[PDB]
Amino acid sequence: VQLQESGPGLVKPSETLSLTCAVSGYSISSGYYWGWIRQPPGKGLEWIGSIYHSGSTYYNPSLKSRVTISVDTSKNQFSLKLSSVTAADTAVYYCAGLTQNDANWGQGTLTTVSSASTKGPSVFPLAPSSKSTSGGTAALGCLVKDYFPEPVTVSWNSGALTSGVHTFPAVLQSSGLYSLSSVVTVPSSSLGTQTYICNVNHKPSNTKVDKKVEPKSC
Amino acid sequence: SVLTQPPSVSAAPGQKVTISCSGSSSNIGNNYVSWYQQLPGTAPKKLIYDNNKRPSGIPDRFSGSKSGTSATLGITGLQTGDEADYYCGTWDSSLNPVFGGGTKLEIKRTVAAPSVFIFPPSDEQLKSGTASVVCLLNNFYPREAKVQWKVDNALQSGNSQESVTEQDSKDSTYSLSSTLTLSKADYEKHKVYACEVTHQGLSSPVTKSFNRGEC
Numbered sequence: 001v002q003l004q005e006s007g008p009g010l011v012k013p014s015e016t017l018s019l020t021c022a023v024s025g026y027s028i029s030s031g032y033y034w035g036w037i038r039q040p041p042g043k044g045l046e047w048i049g050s051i052y053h054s055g056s057t058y059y060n061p062s063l064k065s066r067v068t069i070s071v072d073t074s075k076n077q078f079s080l081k082l083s084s085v086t087a088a089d090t091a092v093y094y095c096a097g098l099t100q101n102d103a104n105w106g107q108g109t110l111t112t113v114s115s116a117s118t119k120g121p122s123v124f125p126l127a128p129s130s131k132s133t134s135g136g137t138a139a140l141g142c143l144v145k146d147y148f149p150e151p152v153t154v155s156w157n158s159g160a161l162t163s164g165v166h167t168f169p170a171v172l173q174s175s176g177l178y179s180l181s182s183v184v185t186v187p188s189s190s191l192g193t194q195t196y197i198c199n200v201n202h203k204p205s206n207t208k209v210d211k212k213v214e215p216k217s218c
Numbered sequence: 219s220v221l222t223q224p225p226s227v228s229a230a231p232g233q234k235v236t237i238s239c240s241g242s243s244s245n246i247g248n249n250y251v252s253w254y255q256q257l258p259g260t261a262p263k264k265l266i267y268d269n270n271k272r273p274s275g276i277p278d279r280f281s282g283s284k285s286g287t288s289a290t291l292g293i294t295g296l297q298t299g300d301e302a303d304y305y306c307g308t309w310d311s312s313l314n315p316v317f318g319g320g321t322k323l324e325i326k327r328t329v330a331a332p333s334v335f336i337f338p339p340s341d342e343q344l345k346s347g348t349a350s351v352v353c354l355l356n357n358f359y360p361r362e363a364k365v366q367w368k369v370d371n372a373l374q375s376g377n378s379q380e381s382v383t384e385q386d387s388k389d390s391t392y393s394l395s396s397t398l399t400l401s402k403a404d405y406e407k408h409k410v411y412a413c414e415v416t417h418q419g420l421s422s423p424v425t426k427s428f429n430r431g432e433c
Contacts, residue, residue: 037315044219045262045305045317058314094261102264102273124340126352131428132335139335139354143343143397166356168395169381179379181395183354185333216338218433 001025003095003106007203010149011113016083021095021106023076032098034078036069038091039108046091051078085113112149112204116176120207121147123200126183128191129216138191140213141183142198146175147205154182155199191215221246221306221318228324231296231390237321239289239306245316249309251289253282256303256320258384265304266291293323301325301385325390331419332358332394336426338433339405349405353413353426355394357386364416365396368427370408374398405430 002024011017021034028034035050049059051069059067068081082089090113095106126132126141133139144152154167161184170180182198192215200209222240229235239251253266264273266282269289281292289306306318332355339349355363361382367374380396396413412427 044319045307046219047315047317050315060314061312101267105261105263108261122343122346124343124350126337126354127340129338129433131426131433132337132354134333134335137333139333139356141337141352141354143340143350143352145343145350166383166386166393166395168383168393171379171381171397173379173399179350179397181352181397183356183393183395185356216433218428 001099001104003097003104005093005095005106005109008110008149008151009112009204010118011085011089011111013086013113013115014084016081017085017089017111017113018082019080019093019095019109019111020077021079023078023097026099028071028076028078029073030099032100034069034071034095034097036080036093036095038093040091048080048082048093087113089113110149110151114149116148118205119146119148119177120205121145121152121180121200121202121209123198123209123211125211125213126181127213127216129218131216131218133188136188137185138188139183139185140191140196141181142200142211142213144180144182144200146173146177146179147202147207148177149204150178151203152178152180153201153203154180156182156184157195157197158199161196219319220310220316221308223304223306223318223321225319226322226324228326229296230326231298233296234292234294235296235323236293237291237304237306237323239291239318241287241289241308243287244311245287245308246284246289247287248311249313251282251284252307253280253289253291254305254307256305258302262305296325298325298390299387301387301390325385327359327390329419330357330359330389330391332356332363332415332417332424334413334415334424334426336411336413336428338411338428338430344402344405347402349400349402351398351400351411353396353398353415355396355415355417357389357391357393358417358419359391360418361392362418363392363394365394366414366416367396367398368410368412368414369398370410371412
């Protein structure tokens with residue numbers, strides 16, 4: 001059984017947020033309930049609403065006037081509509097459901113509410129050299145810069161490289177754009193031979209970049 | 219976020235921690251309490267349901283108890299993979315889900331000196347008219363770290379941004395990335411770009427620097 005939310009995106013102020021949750025490996029009419037829970041950046045969990053076995057719905061009282069949760073039996077998915085959104089609605093939204101004891105959670109999708117606009121990132125290398133060398137260990141990375149909104153995903157060598165990888169939290173620059181760095185420490189002897197590529201995905205702008213990181217000539 | 223949890227808790231690997239959850243009459247008092255684990259970047263995973271009960275998969279290192287309007291999560295034999303946010307959850311007076319604010323678990327380990335690396339701006343970024351200089355502080359403990367940028371021995375202030383990873387799943391260390399960003403024009407008005415690092419594990423401040431044009 002797997003739940004999958006629609007990809008991360010941007011929603012302007014006062015329009016209507018729309019999310020879907022695709023249920024896999026389980027018929028949606030056979031569950032106790034299905035629902036949504038959101039989590040603002042750096043904050044805790046907030047219950048939004050649930051739809052039950054019969055179709056009866058219960059919503060968060062402070063949100064009830066803006067929330068609609070429905071179920072598409074044919075697509076085996078259920079939805080969440082949230083109208084008249086403000087920046088306070090910016091959060092990671094999770095779909096969840098109980099099937100037959102713990103519920104099944106989706107992986108979550110970050111929805112940003114902002115009057116700013118969508119921009120894909122530029123990807124620059126953090127090239128290794130003597131300056132990023134400590135003993136037998138060398139550091140290299142990728143600078144994912146000037147994107148909006150969050151998030152981005154970074155992997156190394158299509159997931160083949162995971163050990164010693166550090167992907168840092170993005171920072172919001174004064175321009176209103178995010179910037180992120182992802183680094184990995186490898187043997188210095190590998191710099192010439194082993195190929196290092198950072199795979200960057202910015203789903204809200206549908207931007208994908210595979211960037212090779214080659215040693216610097218110091 | 220209606221229930222009250224301590225902001226954070228900490229202990230050494232192999233030791234025990236307890237995370238309390240404070241509610242009131244209408245929620246924790248009358249209803250069952252559940253516990254969740256949220257590793258960074260992942261959805262919450264249930265550890266405890268019905269006050270005391272573990273679903274399949276959850277090791278018996280995790281336990282729970284309830285006493286009045288207060289619930290407690292217990293983690294015995296701490297491992298470096300246990301670093302996460304921990305939430306309590308129950309039902310309110312209207313049987314709607316409510317949650318606590320969360321508790322960050324930090325694994326206490328031995329002091330670790332940071333490895334310092336510096337990265338000159340790439341030619342590609344230079345062509346666009348900007349120069350970002352990156353300083354990496356790798357695998358250190360504890361979390362506190364001082365990073366100062368110096369451009370021709372001029373201390374930079376308010377000119378840079380930094381962020382810190384969550385505690386590493388293997389050695390329970392932190393890493394820090396500081397970015398100093400200049401216009402191309404300003405970048406070409408200076409020679410020495412330096413990163414100065416102060417940490418508990420360093421007998422003296424470590425400096426990593428390069429000159430513009432040698433790379």
